[PDB]
Amino acid sequence: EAARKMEELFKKHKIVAVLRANSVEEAIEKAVAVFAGGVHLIEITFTVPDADTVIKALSVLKEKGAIIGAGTVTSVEQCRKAVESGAEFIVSPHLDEEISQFCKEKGVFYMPGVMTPTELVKAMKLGHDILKLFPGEVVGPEFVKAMKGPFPNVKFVPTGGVDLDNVCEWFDAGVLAVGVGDALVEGDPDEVREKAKEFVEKIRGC
Amino acid sequence: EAARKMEELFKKHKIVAVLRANSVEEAIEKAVAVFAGGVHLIEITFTVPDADTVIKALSVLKEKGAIIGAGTVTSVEQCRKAVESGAEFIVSPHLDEEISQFCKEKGVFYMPGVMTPTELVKAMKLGHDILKLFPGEVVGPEFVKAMKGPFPNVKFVPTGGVDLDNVCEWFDAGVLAVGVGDALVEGDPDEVREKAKEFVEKIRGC
Amino acid sequence: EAARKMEELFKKHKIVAVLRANSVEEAIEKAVAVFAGGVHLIEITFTVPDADTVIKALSVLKEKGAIIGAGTVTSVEQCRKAVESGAEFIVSPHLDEEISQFCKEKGVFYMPGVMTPTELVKAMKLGHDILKLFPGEVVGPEFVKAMKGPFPNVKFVPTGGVDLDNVCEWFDAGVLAVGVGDALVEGDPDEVREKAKEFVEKIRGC
Amino acid sequence: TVRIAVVRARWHAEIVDACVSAFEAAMRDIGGDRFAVDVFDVPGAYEIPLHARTLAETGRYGAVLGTAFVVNGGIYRHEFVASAVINGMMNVQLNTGVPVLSAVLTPHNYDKSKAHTLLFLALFAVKGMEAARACVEILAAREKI
Amino acid sequence: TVRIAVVRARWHAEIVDACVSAFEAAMRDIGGDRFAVDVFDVPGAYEIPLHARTLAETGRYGAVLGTAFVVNGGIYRHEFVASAVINGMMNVQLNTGVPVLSAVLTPHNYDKSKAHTLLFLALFAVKGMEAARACVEILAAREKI
Known part of the structure; x- marks a missing residue:
């Protein structure tokens, strides 16, 4: 059931922020x-630290419409912590x-x-229809187009290799959503808010 | 035995068309x-549809020298259908x-x-000496050259990332044959016949 | 229940065609x-004739996602015919x-x-929260803005006075959807299809 | 109760189906509880005349409606079939005494683009509705005579 | 076992053969051990209607399939024969009670260049396969009626 909910949410919102910070307060401000x-x-x-x-x-x-997930989880122990903590x-x-x-088993969406x-x-x-392309940059939008033929029901969320200039280059390839970070997220909280608006409008265009 | 027959056929003909169409008649005309x-x-x-x-x-x-195979087969059930149908x-x-x-078991060539x-x-x-590089574009001719060292007996047929301008760039890397499509195949049947001639002559040069 | 379904559909699609024709076949082609x-x-x-x-x-x-309604109904007898006929x-x-x-009583949406x-x-x-502004041209987008103050929960679909150049002038006023016709609809079926695309893209921008 | 048989081609079935569905619905609205509709399939337009004759000579049907969508043909010429089928039904009608009707249509120019597939579904639905009226009116005319 | 007769033209035999060969193979795949196919030759398309009638009136065949390739004609007009043959088969079908089918095709524009001879061999092979399905489906429909 969770997969269906999320597939609709990714189609609806298109951009996913990938956030990192050096402190709890910095992560929150961003x-x-x-x-x-x-x-x-x-x-x-x-x-x-302090994820x-x-x-x-x-x-x-969450009550304002935010969806908060756990990025880069590489183990079960981390998954358990992520699940208890939202x-x-x-x-x-x-x-x-x-x-x-x-x-x-926990009813959560895994990608x-x-x-x-x-x-x-x-x-x-x-059973995973939505996949993430971790090594973006190395694997460009050409991959997403190429795999559409043999795997028409597989949707992608590339991470990395997505910046403002390539917005829509990725969506034109069949991308579901984009894992933007180190562009959207980096910089001063006011710079961050303005860039987030630029990405959303550039995305709305396609 | 089938592998030996095919290795010689790929060396002899060099270009393999990868054909898709929206109908039976269109596939035949192409x-x-x-x-x-x-x-x-x-x-x-x-x-x-109607493969x-x-x-x-x-x-x-077939009696005029055509060899017809089954492209992009992703399962056994499809393989069974492909084998009964030539x-x-x-x-x-x-x-x-x-x-x-x-x-x-069926005596057919699998790549x-x-x-x-x-x-x-x-x-x-x-037991597979001839391999296809599906994600062409992503994996360029550099891969084919690089893997020649450790695997001198492995031959490749790249698919995608092959167009008229890169003809011979791929063969110079050690390519056996090229899986050209969306160039050779796309367009009007008379445009298709002329492009096929251009690819063959460009290939004959190397 | 019907009102909730429709409110979401109008928010989602934004443009409503208002169609008239001089024959059954012409209405269908348009x-x-x-x-x-x-x-x-x-x-x-x-x-x-022949509505x-x-x-x-x-x-x-309908199964392809079209929603067909009955325009300009001025009586109960016409409503009864409209309801039996979709x-x-x-x-x-x-x-x-x-x-x-x-x-x-019939479970249909009335605006x-x-x-x-x-x-x-x-x-x-x-009980009607979504209203149509029939006399468009006479009542411009200023009305929609002006009535937002005292009636924040009333949404509008203006008809008339909406053309391609004023697309977004109306949405910026708080418009739910626009009753475009005599622009979108008028002309040759191929001219009509192209104008429909222009209206949709102009609308997607806002 | 008077039975009406419908003989359907299976080429471009979606278009043919739009017509028969509309026909049956119209028949319920116009002659509900007076008429019943029996639907039979044939491979395509060319077989309609014989299947229709066989049904008509059975004695169970007051009328037979043949339906099909014949297209330009692309590579091959369609005119020879389209005329053979229409004339075939006319010969059956006259020598059997059953008002075989038809909705065997050949478009001026049919493209395979979705704009055209959608247009023909709607137009065939219209033809279905018209055929239902025709069935009832001709059968009534044939009692008055 | 139900027999199906095939009546073949001998003009452009390679094209006609592509069709009948595909037909027979398809018949084995669809109705193996239910149907048998008897192939007969005639000089050309014009003789199909009579030969087909003679076979149909013999009582041995459940269906007859006529096949031919009619071409533009070059110097001479082909339209008069193409329509005579199709209408001929329709008249036989109706008055004999045998679902005579056809794969008598006339191309929009046939060139003699090898590109065209190859295209038609493949397209006729397709028509053969389709005819096999049609034979089985119409014969079944005629039992259900």
């Missing part, structure tokens, strides 16, 4: 600047069977990372 | 334009053990897709 | 050109109590016309 700027889907990198604290603190935005999404840089089984056709297939066999 | 233009190895994408119908209809060209080749975007075992060194090795362990 | 061009909400003026025939014929598009919406140039009661503050109020007392 999450708010990004949210205020029009980006409702936010991942909190879970490998940072659980940031996700719980930002639960106050985390609507669990995403990872690579496919993992233990994480997928855990996430199904594994994939960068090759053999990995897309294993992920599909395990 | 297959004939391509054949008339000098391309004898043709794959019929098997994921299209079996197109492959059986084009069996009339299909000299079965090719796929990814390596698959069930497909390989099926194809060996799995690979894009990494760990996948080349698994394919070699299973 | 409805299809408009639909193909991206406009999914279509009203068939019900005061034309019931056109609405039933276009029910074939008609998801019943709209009228003026507020009418008998029509409203009929429409509620009465209003052009003054005293009429907005009577319509609200009768």
Whole structure:
């Protein structure tokens, strides 16, 4: 059921912020600047200090339409912490069977990372239709177009290699949503809010 | 035995058309334009409507030297249909053990897709010396050159990322044959026949 | 329940075609050109010859996402015919109590016309939150802005006075959807399809 | 109760179906509880004349409606079939004594683009409705005579 | 076992053969062990209607399929034959009670260049396969009636 809910949310909002910060307060100020700027889907990198604290603190935005997930989760122990501490999404840089089984049992949405056709297939066999392309830059929009032929029902969220200038280059390839960070997120909270608006409007165009 | 027959055929003809169409008649008109233009190895994408119908209809060209195979086969059930309906080749975007075992039992040539060194090795362990590089564009001719060192007996047929301008750039890298489509195949049947001639002559040069 | 369904549909699609024609076949060719061009909400003026025939014929598009309603209904007898013959919406140039009661009993969405503050109020007392401004041109976007203050929960669909150049002038005023016709609809079916695309893209911008 | 048979082609079935569905609905609105409709399939337009004759000579039907969508043909010429089928039905009608009606239509110029597939679904639905009226009116005329 | 007769023209035999071969193969795949196919030759398209009638009136065949390739004609007009043949088969069908089918095709514009000879071999093979399905489906429809 969670997968259907999320597929609609990604189609609706298009841009997902990938957030990292050097402190709890910094992560919060950025999450708010990004949210205020029009980006409702936010991942909190879970490998940072006090990741659980940031996700719980930002639960106050949940009632305003924010969706807070756990970014870069590489293990089950981290998944367990992410689930107790909110985390609507669990995403990872690579496919993992233990994480997928855990996430199904807990009723949460899991989006594994994939960068090759053999990995897309294993992920599909395990029930994952929405995949993340972790190694963006290395794997450009050409991949997304190329894999549409053999795998018409697989949707992608590339991470990295997405900046303001390539907005719509990715959507024209068949992209579901984009994992923008280090552009949208980086800089002063007022710079962040303005860039978030630029990304949303550039995206609305396509 | 089938592998030896095909290795010689790919060396001899060099260009393989990758054909898709929106109807049975369109697929036939293009297959004939391509054949008339000098391309004898043709794959019929098997994921299209009426793929079996197109492959059986084009069996009339078999006696004129055409070789018709089944493109983009992603399952055993599709392989079974492809085998009953002709299909000299079965090719796929990814390596698959069930497909390989099926194809060996039926005496047909199977060419799995690979894009990494760990996948080349698994394919070699299973007995496949000729591999397809499905994610062309992403994996350029540099890959083919790079893998020649450790795997001197592995030959490639890249798909995608091959256009008229890069003809011979790929052959200079050690390519066996090229999986050209969306260039050779796209357009009006008379445009298709002329482009097929241009690809063949550009290839004959190297 | 019908009102909630429709409020979401108008917010989602924004442009409603108002269609008139001199024959059944002409009405159908235009409805299809408009639909193909991206406009999914279509009203068939019900005061034309063979209005019931056109609405039933276009029910074939219902499964493709078309919503066909009955335009300019000025009486109960016409409402009864519109309801038997499909008609998801019943709209009228003026507020009418008998029509409203009929429409509620049949479970259909009714959108009465209003052009003054005293009429907005009577319509609200009768339960109508979405109103049509029939005398567009006479009542410009200034009205929609002005009435937002005292009636924040009343949404409008102006008819007339909406052309391509004023697209977004109306939405910036607080408009829900626009009743475009005699622009979108007029002309050759191929001219109609292209204009429909221009209106949709101009609207997507705001 | 008077039975009406419908003989349908299976080419471009979506278009053919739009017509028969509209026909049946119209028949319920016009002659509900007076007429019943029996739908039969044939591979395509060319077989309509024989199937229709066989039904007409059975004695169970007051009328038979043949329907089909014949297209330009692309590579091959369609005119020879379109005229054979219409004339075939006319010969059956006259020698069987059953008012075989038709909605075997050939477009001036049919493209395969969705704009055209949508147009023909709607136009065939209209033809279905018109055929229902024609069935009732001709059958009544044939009692008055 | 139900027999189906095929009557073949000998003009442009390679094209005609592509069709009948595909037909027979399709018949084995669809109705193997239910149907048998008897192939007969005639000089050309013009003789199909009589030969087909003679076979149909023999009582041995459930269906007859006539096949031919009629071309533009170059110097001479072909339209008069193409329509005579199609109408001929229609008259036989109706007065014999045998669902005579056809794959007598006339191209919009046939060139003698190899590109066209190859195209028509493939398209006729397709028509053969379609005819096999039509034979089985119409014969079944005629039992259900």
